Write a protein that binds this DNA or RNA. Sequence first.
DNA 1: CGCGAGTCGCG
Length: 165
Amino acid sequence: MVEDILAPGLRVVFCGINPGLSSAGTGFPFAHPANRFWKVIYQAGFTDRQLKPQEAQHLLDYRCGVTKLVDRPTVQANEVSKQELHAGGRKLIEKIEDYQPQALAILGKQAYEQGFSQRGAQWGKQTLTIGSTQIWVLPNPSGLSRVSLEKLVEAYRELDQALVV
DNA sequence: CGCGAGTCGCG
C-alpha cells in the first residue's frame, strides 16, 4: 500500500493513476528510478533539490502533496479500468474538499477525463474547479511516455509559476 | 442528424 502525502495549506497536490509494482513494495510514490517525477518537480521549481522516493514526506515542507486515483498496484497505468478510475475520482474529490489545496494536478490526460468524466480535455489548466482549488492536467512522468523531459519540465513549470504568492 | 460506445505505432 502507498500512503498519501496530504496536509492543509498545500499549494499543489500531485495525483497519479495507481502505484507501480516497485512503488507498491517500497511504500513510496513514484519509487521506480525510471519515473521522471522527482527530477521534473525539482527542475520545474517545486523543490530545491531532487528528492529520493524515500524523502517523499518532506514534500509537505515545500507545501506539495501526492496521492493517486486507484490504489491497486500495476505494471502499466492502462490496466486500471475506467470503472476504477471513475470511482477513484469521486474519492479524490473528497480529499480535495478536505485538504483544500490551491491546485489539484492530475498526471494523466486520460486519467483526468475518466476520473472526472470529461471529454476532449486539453493539457494545462481546466475551467473545472473544486471550490477554491483549481485543476490542472499534466503529462505523466513515466519513462513509458514518449514525452521528453524538456517538455515534461515546462508543463510543470507553467503550473509552478501559475501559482503565485 | 448526435450521441455513446467498440487498437496501433511512436523514443
